[PDB]
Amino acid sequence: EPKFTKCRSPERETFSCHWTDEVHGPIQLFYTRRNQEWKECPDYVSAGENSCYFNSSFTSIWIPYCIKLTSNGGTVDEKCFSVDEIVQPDPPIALNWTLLNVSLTGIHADIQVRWEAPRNADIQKGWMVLEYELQYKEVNETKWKMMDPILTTSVPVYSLKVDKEYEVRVRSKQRNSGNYGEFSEVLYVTLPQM
């Protein structure tokens, strides 16, 4: 049913909006950088099936935008936002881990998990300053244990039972603005009986 879903800016430089209208007439996107006159969607195709891609030239981080989705004249959904409000950065690339050591008891171990920034933050720098939230749980536990949001691409995980299989996933966010992106590919950490 012809409503908005998500406008998302992956780096703080571009963005797009999505909706639902995959049979459920012509839907159109309309925008205005608030400062009445609507411009219309610049590129209804680069993001695919039900999208509108606002590129570099069309995206300014100093003004609020508004958008109304017009299904054959009628406005169905409409929404205003600003670009830091819709920053939702790509998950981290290439997680791994290292075995620090095991106890005398042999019951527990200490690992360290590294990851690597999304490619589109490298490119940026001094614009897009990321913070990572690592969470982990046992392969058959239920609630994820979360860790404090760290700015580094490495955090140790302590007290893991040497023969219990584990899942580690980390997600990212811009330093105080926007909200979290999706999670990384989930690492499966398995500790050897040493």
């Binding site: 100093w62 609020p64 205003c80 001094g126 614009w127």
Partner: protein, 184 residues
Amino acid sequence: FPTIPLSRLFDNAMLRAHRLHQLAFDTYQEFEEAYIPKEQKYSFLQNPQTSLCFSESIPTPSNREETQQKSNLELLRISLLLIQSWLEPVQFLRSVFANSLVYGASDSNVYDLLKDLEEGIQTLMGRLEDGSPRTGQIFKQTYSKFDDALLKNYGLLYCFRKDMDKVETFLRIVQCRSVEGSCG
């Protein structure tokens, strides 16, 4: 519709000011230790042919004491005119930036940051209505102009490094006064 708060407004402008200054600094310093000896670094500063910067037509504070006796609309205005003054002259650093190992130094990239930071300061002059009688000097829009080649390029690059340091300082002084809890 949503207002973007002054907090984020200032915060993004300092990302830009700081990237512009970090680019001018690193690019200048790698040019210097490759093509300028101290012999020449001094000869340059010594003699006005190779010392004055076209940006000097804009009155800017020189020390802390004068800087803090300027208003928020004056510091943002001096800041705007210094950025507007580099919009065309960064073209002449194309030949120096193309051979720079600094990621990010390119006439097209640096012009983009100067153009974005320019919109921001204008956005900040529209929010910050903080008393200032709008008059004469500084409210005359003299964006500074610009009239061997190794020293030519070192002069442009010496003045970019400095004016970016001025823009970065001047925006931080007004963020520190406008947005409490920014600096402490």
